[PDB]
């Protein structure tokens, strides 16, 4: 029941989604090892993900969290990178998309920095790079990210450098406390707390 609606670059919706990609790029402490070396992207396509059943699954859970948290879903738009982007848009988020070895435990992880999510496009640590060239820093191959609606509800705040939420909470916020440029990262423990709104196809660009 998933259809993908192709957006025009003339559409203000495309523009604001792209602006969110580009402006949340940062340098990484691995010097580009996982995600490649780039300051910006070449956005090839942005598609809206329409799945009624997955959307209704999302809103049902959203209303539940909201009601446990003074009518406040605490909803964000966050990036997600994964080799399983394609299963996610058709079948939705579930336990097979969880990062078992993550620093905040076995859950599904999201990023405010698009470039953080980019490090996961080819696997943990960027795996072995793109399938074609085995290059983690490939400038040729097409990459895909999700820009997702995420229900955080009451988030356990964790200062720093599948399972359950900490009791009394609906998610975990990893606050950065070493790198002053890093944006927050987030973990949900139920697939229903995220909807894969936008599929963005792109290339990282070789810096000049």
Give the pairing type, strands 194-204 and 41-50: antiparallel
**191 sits near ligand 29F (criterion: CB under 6 A):** no
State the binding string over 118-147 for Zn ion (x if CB under 5 A, else -): ------------x-xx----x-xx------
Q: Which of 61, 62, 97, 136 binds ligand 29F (CB under 6 A)?
A: 97
- CA–CA separation, 190 and 62 (whole Å): 11
| CA separation for the pair 5, 137 (Å, rounded) | 29
What is the C-alpha separation between 110 and 116, in angstroms, rounded?
Answer: 9
**Identity of the residue, 34 or 66, whose beta carbon is nearer to ligand 29F in the bound complex:** 34
Residue pair 118/183 in contact (Cβ under 8 Å)? The answer is no
Q: Decide if residue 105 touches ligand 29F (CB under 6 A).
A: no
The half-sphere exposure of 45 on its side-chain side, counting CA atoms within 13 A, is 11
Judge whether 169 is annotated as a binding position. no
Which lies closer to ligand 29F via its Cβ, residue 38 or residue 110?
A: 110
Residue 143 near ligand 29F by CB under 6 A: no
81 binds, among Zn ion, ligand 29F, none (CB under 5 to 8 A by kind): ligand 29F
Q: Pick one of ligand 29F, Zn ion, none as the site partner of residue 116 (Cβ within 5 to 8 A by kind).
A: ligand 29F
- Using CA atoms, how far apart are residues 142 and 90, in angstroms rounded to an integer? 20
Q: Is 81 a residue that touches ligand 29F (CB under 6 A)?
A: yes
**Residue 6: exposed, middle, or buried by beta-carbon count in 10 A (0-12, 13-18, 19+)?**
exposed
Q: Which residues form the interface with ligand 29F (CB under 6 A)?
A: 79-84, 97, 99, 109-111, 116-117, 120, 123-124, 185
């Amino acid at each position: 029941g998933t259809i993908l609606i192709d957006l025009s670059p003339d559409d203000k919706e495309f523009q604001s989604v792209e602006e969110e990609m580009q402006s949340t790029v940062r340098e990484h402490r691995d010097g580009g090892h996982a995600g490649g070396i780039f300051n910006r992207y070449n956005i090839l396509k942005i598609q809206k993900v329409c799945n009624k059943k997955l959307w209704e699954r999302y809103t049902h859970r959203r209303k539940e969290v909201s009601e446990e948290n003074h009518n406040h879903a605490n909803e964000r738009m966050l990036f997600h990178g994964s080799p399983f982007v394609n299963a996610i848009i058709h079948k939705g988020f579930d336990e097979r998309h969880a990062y078992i070895g993550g620093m905040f435990g076995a859950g599904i992880y999201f990023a405010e920095n698009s470039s953080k999510s980019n490090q996961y496009v080819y696997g943990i640590g960027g795996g072995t790079g793109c399938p074609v060239h085995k290059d983690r820093s490939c400038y040729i191959c097409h990459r895909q990210l999700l820009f997702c609606r995420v229900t955080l509800g009451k988030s356990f705040l964790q200062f720093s450098a599948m399972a359950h939420s900490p009791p009394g909470h609906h998610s975990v916020t990893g606050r950065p406390s070493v790198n002053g440029l890093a944006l927050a990262e987030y973990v949900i423990y139920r697939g229903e707390q995220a909807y894969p709104e936008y599929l963005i196809t792109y290339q990282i660009m070789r810096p000049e």
